[PDB]
Amino acid sequence: ALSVEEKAQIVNEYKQAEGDTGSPEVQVALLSANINKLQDHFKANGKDHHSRRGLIRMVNQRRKLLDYLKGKDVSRYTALIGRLGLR
RNA sequence: UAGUCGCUGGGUAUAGACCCGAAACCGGGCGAUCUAUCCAUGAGCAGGUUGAAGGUUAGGUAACACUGACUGGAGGACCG
């Protein structure tokens, strides 16, 4: 998984009436942080496709959570596409 | 019951043995200023084409891919 220090760290800018861990600030961008740091083990273990099928499972679900923000909230979408180093 | 040693011729033997004439064989040298390779040290290859590997960049991807563009200037390469 992610680091025990980190998975409780990254929520500190996702707060937005802080008790939310459910809006797509969290399941995009905890999950975007899952994308950006678990690249490491692939370089050593390139013969195990079980771990990047989870990557494509949630980067679609991130894009699915981008897809609902296409219509529900375009303005807070700019906080996602403008930030995080996307695209 | 006649032979011997000359001398002059005719033959013969051994010597190049009437004269001329092989290809070749062997022994000592001479020669790689030609040529065949090699060794050292020098230098010659007008001009025009082609556009390999590498780079850079954009684009694309989990980084690897992978496609453009620009650059690059390879070759018992091409034309002369």
- Experimental technique: cryo-EM
Give dist(CA A31, CA A11) in Å, integer: 11
What does the CA dihedral A15, A16, A22, A27 come to, rounded to 10 degrees? -60
Q: Per the structure block, which two tokens stand in for A81?
A: 């596409």
Nucleotides of chain B in contact with protein CB (under 7 A) are 62-63
Summarize chain A as % helix, strand, coil (round to 5).
55, 0, 45
* CA–CA separation, A86 and A66 (whole Å): 12
Asked whether residue A79, judged by its CB, lies under 7 Å from any atom of the DNA or RNA strand B, the reply is no
Are A56 and A34 spatial neighbours (Cβ–Cβ below 8 Å)? no
The ranges assigned to domains in chain A are: 2-87
Q: A12: which 2 tokens?
A: 């500190």
Determine the distance between A58 (CA) and B39 (C1') in angstroms: 75
Task: Estimate in Å the CA A20 to C1' B62 gap, whole number.
Answer: 29
In this complex, the answer to whether residue A85 has its CB under 7 A from any atom of chain B, a nucleic strand, is no
Q: Which superfamily, per CATH, for A2-87?
A: S15/NS1, RNA-binding (1.10.287.10)
